[PDB]
Amino acid sequence: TYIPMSQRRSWADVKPIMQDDGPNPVVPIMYSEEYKDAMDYFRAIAAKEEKSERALELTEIIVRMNPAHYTVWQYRFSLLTSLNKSLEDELRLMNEFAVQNLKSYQVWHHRLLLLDRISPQDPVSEIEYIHGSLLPDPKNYHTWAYLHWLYSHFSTLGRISEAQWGSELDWCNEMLRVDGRNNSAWGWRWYLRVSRPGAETSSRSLQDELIYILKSIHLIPHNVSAWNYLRGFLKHFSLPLVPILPAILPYTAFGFPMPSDPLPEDTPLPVPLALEYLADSFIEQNRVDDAAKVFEKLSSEYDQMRAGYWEFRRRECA
Amino acid sequence: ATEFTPSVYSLVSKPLPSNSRPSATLDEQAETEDLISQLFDLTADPNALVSEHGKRYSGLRKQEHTQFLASSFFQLPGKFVSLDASRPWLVFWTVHSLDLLGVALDQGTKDRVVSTLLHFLSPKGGFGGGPANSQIPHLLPTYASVCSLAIAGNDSSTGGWKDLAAARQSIYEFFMRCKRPDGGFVVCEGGEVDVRGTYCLLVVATLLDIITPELLHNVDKFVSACQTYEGGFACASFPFPEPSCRVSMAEAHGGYTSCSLNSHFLLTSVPLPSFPLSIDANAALRWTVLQQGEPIEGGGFRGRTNKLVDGCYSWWVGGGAPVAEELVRREKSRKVIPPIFNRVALQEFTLVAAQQDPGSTGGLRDKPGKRPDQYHTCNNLSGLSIAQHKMSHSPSTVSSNRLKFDASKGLPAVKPVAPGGGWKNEDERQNARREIWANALGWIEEEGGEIIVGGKDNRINTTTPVFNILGLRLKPFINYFYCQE
Ligand SMILES: CCCC[C@H]1CN(c2cccc(Cl)c2)C(=O)CN1Cc1cncn1Cc1ccc(Br)cc1
Ligand SMILES: CC(C)=CCC/C(C)=C\CC/C(C)=C\COP(=O)(O)OP(=O)(O)O
Numbered sequence A: 001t002y003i004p005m006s007q008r009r010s011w012a013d014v015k016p017i018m019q020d021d022g023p024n025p026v027v028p029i030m031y032s033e034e035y036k037d038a039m040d041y042f043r044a045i046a047a048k049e050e051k052s053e054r055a056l057e058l059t060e061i062i063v064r065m066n067p068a069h070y071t072v073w074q075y076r077f078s079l080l081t082s083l084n085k086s087l088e089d090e091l092r093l094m095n096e097f098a099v100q101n102l103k104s105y106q107v108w109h110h111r112l113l114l115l116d117r118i119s120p121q122d123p124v125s126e127i128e129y130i131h132g133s134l135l136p137d138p139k140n141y142h143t144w145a146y147l148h149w150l151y152s153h154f155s156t157l158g159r160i161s162e163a164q165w166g167s168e169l170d171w172c173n174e175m176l177r178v179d180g181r182n183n184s185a186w187g188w189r190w191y192l193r194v195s196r197p198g199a200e201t202s203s204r205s206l207q208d209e210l211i212y213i214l215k216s217i218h219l220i221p222h223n224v225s226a227w228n229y230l231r232g233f234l235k236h237f238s239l240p241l242v243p244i245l246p247a248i249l250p251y252t253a254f255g256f257p258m259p260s261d262p263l264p265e266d267t268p269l270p271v272p273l274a275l276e277y278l279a280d281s282f283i284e285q286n287r288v289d290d291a292a293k294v295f296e297k298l299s300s301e302y303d304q305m306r307a308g309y310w311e312f313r314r315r316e317c318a
Numbered sequence B: 001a002t003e004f005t006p007s008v009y010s011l012v013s014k015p016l017p018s019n020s021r022p023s024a025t026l027d028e029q030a031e032t033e034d035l036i037s038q039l040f041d042l043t044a045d046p047n048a049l050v051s052e053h054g055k056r057y058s059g060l061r062k063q064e065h066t067q068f069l070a071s072s073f074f075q076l077p078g079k080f081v082s083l084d085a086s087r088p089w090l091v092f093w094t095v096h097s098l099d100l101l102g103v104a105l106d107q108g109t110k111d112r113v114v115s116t117l118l119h120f121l122s123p124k125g126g127f128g129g130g131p132a133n134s135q136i137p138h139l140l141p142t143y144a145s146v147c148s149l150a151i152a153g154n155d156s157s158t159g160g161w162k163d164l165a166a167a168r169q170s171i172y173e174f175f176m177r178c179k180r181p182d183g184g185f186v187v188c189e190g191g192e193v194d195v196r197g198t199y200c201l202l203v204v205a206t207l208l209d210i211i212t213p214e215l216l217h218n219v220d221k222f223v224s225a226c227q228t229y230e231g232g233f234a235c236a237s238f239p240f241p242e243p244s245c246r247v248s249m250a251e252a253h254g255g256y257t258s259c260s261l262n263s264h265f266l267l268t269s270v271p272l273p274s275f276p277l278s279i280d281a282n283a284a285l286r287w288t289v290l291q292q293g294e295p296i297e298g299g300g301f302r303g304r305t306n307k308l309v310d311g312c313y314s315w316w317v318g319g320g321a322p323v324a325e326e327l328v329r330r331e332k333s334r335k336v337i338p339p340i341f342n343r344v345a346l347q348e349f350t351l352v353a354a355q356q357d358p359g360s361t362g363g364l365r366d367k368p369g370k371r372p373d374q375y376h377t378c379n380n381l382s383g384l385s386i387a388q389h390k391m392s393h394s395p396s397t398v399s400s401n402r403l404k405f406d407a408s409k410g411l412p413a414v415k416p417v418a419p420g421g422g423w424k425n426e427d428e429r430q431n432a433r434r435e436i437w438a439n440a441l442g443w444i445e446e447e448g449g450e451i452i453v454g455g456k457d458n459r460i461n462t463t464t465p466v467f468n469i470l471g472l473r474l475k476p477f478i479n480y481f482y483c484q485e
């Protein structure tokens, strides 16, 4: 059975405070006795601004019932710093919170505040945990954003070595090997290879990156992630589209990779984004009529869901 | 008007090609294709003149959706505890959906809605997700509360707007405590930093006339740096040490692309020198239209590349298309018409796939197989409105708003927290009030651009881009706080 907190000697001194949203509020929620009791005493704890171990226990009980309660998460982090608690132990508790599927914006932000305050000399253990935590959800948006922050924050402090960057690309390359359609891993590769401030921009790196992109397209010619990465790559580095066209034309119905002698099975032609490449390549050659003809075919035959958009692109050329 | 918006029933439905390369993304994509295509095969084409015998009828079940939302004015089961910090969102999802569905509340219920939200207003500034004696203020409930007060409140002593006007200084001070030097905002004390907070803050600041130069510094740079190589926008950008450069922190996503486009659009109204920092509008429009699914997936929108279509992105991605379209129009004009997405297919997804099965609980949902909820009900209907009504930002309407604006009327100017944080003089502050007010009321529904798939009984009311409340709510609300009549 449940023992109310008014029947506990450890809380006999505390007068609970009731929730005050008026005598007849809209969108009320039918709380359990356990959840209402904990928030009643939390309202009192926060009123007296008590920083204690029982307040710490109370915050954990509350966030186990509602992991999205941002006020209680704010008070909990204020409790950990005031009482000089073990932030490493709190990370072990956060590991259990993900095991038992207690997740939200607030749990992920709490973990970030912990790593920020711990400020470890080497955050390799946290990087490894993030990699492993992607097993149930390889595309968890909060996790990928947290990984971006971890590398960005600790590289600002100078604590990401060259070997750490190198193994991170190894891990990212493996993620795209398991599922080349993981657009989150493509975005991570863009950070590692292009956008991060310490990235190398040389002639070999541009060739290496272009080889990886074309091979990824030839493996999965209908993968939108690879096509968008290609268009962003050429645009970001102001590279022309015409030289690469021999590798793209087989999809529209030279020392860079090429498609297979017959294309892989289940590869119907033409690939709509390959046509968009051809049309933009025509525009690069200042050939507006040829570009308008490709947009017209995209609008009326090959990408009819975007018929209005491809028609708008056709009208620009004329 | 349907020349370049073909129905999904008129197009061949074929799966995403595999290229003989199985993966987990393809497994889930093929499973949801079957789930959506089966329901379309069971449903009569809404563009048919006589409903087919044996198929389900796809008409908008507005009364079922009204009863689904009705439970919010009585009680919510215990499983709603996960939303106990988002109750202003439960209010907004309800009162805005009812506005879209054409269902009015009586004055007693509106008074309850106003009174409940005022119990969420903290004297130190801003709204929380619940009673002020239990929850600290937060940028996201602040937006939802302000918009809900615009929908359910009025200008009387019991209307709630008067209390909002009295709280303008404290809310502003709360906004400034949230501000970071790089231009980002924490959503609350010790909270996360993303473009949802920027969007929510800029909307409320625009509506309540509390925008200052110190509030906006670097805000345009934070948002602009969220644009990824795909064309859409990520949740945040990181400042490398004022900062030497800013880098996006994740994928382009429909939700954050909506907040970023809306934030940037709101900033273009501000008359500051070389502000806001530019974005790649062409790439944002391209990314938007690319997220509309194929006919086999009902023509709904997905939130990011190689993920699944979801009815809630009809508002997030579809509702961003008019904003991205206007930014593209401005850029083409600065260097010197068919719809930009399939307005018909999006309505078909809403009517066929996003509605709960008939005779059940009502409400709208993410996908077949998912329970409906208040969040997907509001955003499906908000996106449907965008598809039904052609929205555009009219420069002539904005010009007409400038001609009728009264700069001599207004609430007290807010006191900036830093000595030089306000506007330079009254001429510059009143010029800012006029531009921000005039552009906020610049969205129009184009005459003759209406497309109501399935018949006029499917028509819902017109929502406003950027703000996502009815124009008939937006005008008297913002006029109150700018003292315009
Ligand atoms: C009523 C239950 C709906 C769950 C939604 C909405 N919701 C939320 C909660 C409070 C306030 C606000 Cl505004 C939103 C979430 O936390 C999770 N959601 C799951 C979702 C559905 N379809 C896409 N998603 C992903 C997504 C994640 C973050 C946000 Br924020 C919005 C959407
Ligand atoms: C103003 C405001 C509150 C905007 C909300 C922002 C929004 C709509 C979405 C953010 C979604 C997110 C962080 C991850 C997607 O979750 P998911 O993986 O479950 O969904 P997905 O697979 O479709 O991307």
Ligand SMILES: O=S(=O)(O)C[C@H](O)CNC1CCCCC1
Pocket (backbone or CB within 6 Å): B060, B061, B062, B063, B064, B065
């Ligand atoms: O589908 S909705 O428009 O939301 C409303 C439902 O159709 C209710 N149907 C009633 C059945 C009994 C006779 C009167 C009508």
Ligand SMILES: O=S(=O)(O)C[C@H](O)CNC1CCCCC1
Pocket (backbone or CB within 6 Å): A043, A046, A047, A071, B122, B123, B124, B125, B132, B133, B134, B135, B136
């Ligand atoms: O009068 S104010 O300072 O504006 C608001 C009061 O401090 C109440 N704050 C709450 C107390 C209980 C925990 C959540 C916050």
Ligand SMILES: O=S(=O)(O)C[C@H](O)CNC1CCCCC1
Pocket (backbone or CB within 6 Å): B059, B454, B455, B456, B457, B458
């Ligand atoms: O107004 S029109 O678009 O020409 C046609 C009507 O709207 C069709 N509405 C139906 C009528 C019969 C019950 C189910 C709805």
Ligand SMILES: [Zn+2]
Pocket (backbone or CB within 6 Å): B310, B311, B312, B313, B366, B376
């Ligand atoms: Zn959704």
